Design brief:
The structure is a homodimer of 418-residue chains. Chain A has helices at residues 3-25, 32-44, 65-87, 93-98, 102-106, 114-132, 134-138, 166-179, 196-199, 238-251, 282-294, 325-336, 356-365, 379-388, 401-417, and strands spanning 51-54, 59-62, 143-147, 182-186, 208-212, 217-219, 224-226, 263-265, 268-272, 303-305, 311-315, 346-350, 370-375, 395-398. Chain A has 418 residues and is α/β, with parallel strands linked by helices. The first copy, chain A, is globular, with a radius of gyration of 22 Å. The structure holds magnesium ion (2 copies). Chains A, B: Substrate binds at residues 263-265.
């Protein structure tokens, strides 16, 4: 009913999710109790419409649509898996997954209809096949680089509970391990506390490398690599002090379930102070922002930024090069000892304009060469993608990530299973 | 209190606005009654918080913030003008306007503060000076091309009442006439019924040329020029028939005060069926969309498109080149007999990604050359602008159109008045 109960529930069913994913990727038995956890988590969100979590001072109405849909699709997926597992006990998990009709499960969620879902699915499948064919030509597996939010994961009203489902995790991990030599994930949010590593349900130390702050931080191999480059050592740590001055403010009753909800990015802090249209009062937001301004201790190398009506930022800087996802990709590839210039295909997935640099860099290195899949892109963005790349023919546009997921599952069913 | 009362009130005070603008641009006396109209229009919107207009079936809560701010700023501006007019009866209007401290009037509306407003103002002024200096170098006045919504005009919750204030109209007209040889306005919405020509408070047949449908239609000189290019004659007129099948649906009680609110664009119809977050019920929207689907009479060259959760489109096509604002600029300049290649500076103003083509085309013709001012642009968009153009130094970023307006007013005060 309250905030911490919701958060703890979601996080529990999420670590349970990771356990399930590990069990499905390492030929381990599927615990019916672990599934029961997700089942209870789903039943809890559907009883009292949406749900409203309250504390001892204020009350917030929270949109749990994404969490509910994720839990639902996961329940259907797992139910199927167990249904074929029971009928044939000692089959390998990929074979059982090859017998799952994921298409029928995901098609009912396409906002434009199943008919469009089918065509987008087929085109995405052929596109992906073109991407996979790179190995048979060059001898080495191609490189896959994607965005998270809106690209591989449906948009969530809260970043704090933007939890990745099981089927997508399994699909992405299998696809990355089987068909790619490099798979990278570039996000704007942090790695942890809460970050992409906490929201994901994937091996993390597997075939997929996760990043944060547009590539300024990475998780590999067992440690965290942070690229300051522009930010000073005093600009840094001061952000840490401010973060300490925020985490205790969250413990009072100011909340972090508003959009982004105070994120600690390598070079800045991004707090969500207001929700569209007007969740949370117009006054509490002002008290919030003023309290944030107070905890900025001159000045002291920390610059305040009102930014928008919904978000607010506290940045270090100013010496630097204005970091973007392109820099993250470049630095990663340079660090790994690989190259984008090497003859072979490159698949890049995105949903917003901030993903265009990733493409840019790629077509600067391999203009043969680059394949792009964009999710829910407006006309202008689609044209921009068509502009950065030559083709046109090398461009693929879908409406939702589930198209990509289903396509990948089909590719796995065809090439890894037969 | 109702819908039509609101619409008629706004339109009346808008034609009154045009009358006032004409009076201020042609050395005519300023009718105190015409000002009184705006005064009553302002008082009517501030009495009962926001306002809710209802009909005989449903009730809608309407955000009239933009209209109220426009009316308010207009009232202050006109009050000043009359205050110096009374103190010196037979002065020329530009001189009186040169004595108006518009900066103090507009600075209180900057969401980031007056301090930022000042710096953005100064930088924009110097930038504009650089733009004006082109005439003294090349002998001919430079070319100015801008976007409307979000660029020269604050965002409005309803396109039907997105009314341009007086001071901005005066400023833009004076600036365009005095410093430019070509001034163009590219919008996505139609020209009329309701269109940009109805929402503007500018001479229309003056120094500024207005367009619609990303340049597919233009108003010059006294007639409307429509570029089909891709759309067939049967694809056209069918859109007109559907439009006829919509305008009568609006007369029932389905409304067009939702965002865009059914727009007749040269190649398509863009209806606003849902508001963020959830103004209007979730069922009435469905009835709306289904009724729209019904009035599509095979099929019959009209393609339906769910697009987003808020908007919906009915497109003709498919043969064409996918028209953008760049094509509008190109076709306009080619039609007028001028050229972007000719040595001289080019100022381009925008707020979204759809304005990037305008820049693109320009830097394809004049890479010396192009100056860009972007309003309320996110980091990614700013970087994209910095990418399309070489400089960097030739880029100017502001937070609100009022910065541009105040800057232009200052330029007028310095060069046209002394
Ligand atoms: Mg993204
Ligand atoms: Mg615009």
């Amino acid at each position: 009913q309250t905030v911490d109960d919701f958060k703890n529930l979601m996080y529990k069913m999420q670590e349970t999710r990771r356990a399930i994913v590990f069990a499905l990727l390492n030929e381990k038995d599927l615990t019916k109790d672990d599934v029961e956890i997700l089942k209870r988590a789903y039943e809890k969100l559907t009883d009292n419409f949406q749900r409203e979590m309250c504390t001892l001072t204020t009350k917030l109405s929270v949109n749990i649509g994404d969490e509910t849909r994720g839990l639902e699709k996961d329940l259907k997926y797992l139910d199927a898996l167990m249904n074929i597992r029971r009928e044939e006990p000692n089959l390998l998990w990929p074979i059982i997954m090859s017998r799952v009709d994921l298409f029928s499960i995901l098609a009912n969620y396409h906002p434009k209809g199943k008919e469009t879902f089918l065509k987008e699915y087929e085109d995405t499948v052929k596109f992906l096949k073109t991407f996979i064919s790179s190995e048979a030509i060059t001898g080495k597996k191609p490189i896959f680089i994607t965005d998270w939010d809106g690209t591989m994961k449906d948009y969530c009203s809260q970043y704090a509970t933007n939890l990745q489902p099981v089927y997508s995790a399994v699909g992405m991990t299998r696809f990355a391990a089987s068909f790619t030599r490099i798979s990278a994930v570039l996000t704007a949010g942090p790695l942890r506390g809460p970050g992409i590593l906490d929201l994901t349900a994937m091996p993390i130390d597997g075939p997929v490398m996760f990043s944060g702050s547009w590539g300024r931080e990475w998780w590999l191999s067992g440690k965290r690599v942070v690229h300051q480059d522009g930010i000073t050592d005093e600009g840094f740590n001061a952000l840490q002090r401010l973060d300490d001055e925020m985490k205790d403010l969250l413990h009072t009753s100011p909340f972090a379930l508003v959009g982004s909800g105070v994120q600690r990015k390598v070079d800045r802090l991004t707090l969500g102070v207001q929700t569209v249209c007007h969740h949370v009062t117009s006054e509490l937001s002002n008290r919030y922002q003023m309290a944030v301004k107070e905890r900025m201790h001159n000045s002291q190398i920390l610059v305040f930024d009102p930014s928008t009506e919904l978000e607010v930022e506290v940045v270090a800087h100013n010496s630097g090069i204005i970091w973007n996802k392109g820099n993250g990709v470049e630095r990663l590839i340079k660090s790994l000892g690989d190259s984008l210039q090497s003859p072979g295909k490159i698949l890049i997935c995105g949903d917003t304009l901030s993903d265009i640099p990733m493409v840019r860099q790629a077509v600067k290195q391999n203009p043969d060469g680059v394949l792009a899949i964009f999710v829910g892109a407006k006309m202008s963005l689609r044209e921009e993608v068509k502009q950065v790349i030559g083709d046109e023919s090398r461009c693929c546009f879908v409406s939702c990530p589930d198209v990509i997921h289903a396509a990948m599952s089909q590719i796995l069913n065809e090439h890894c299973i037969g």
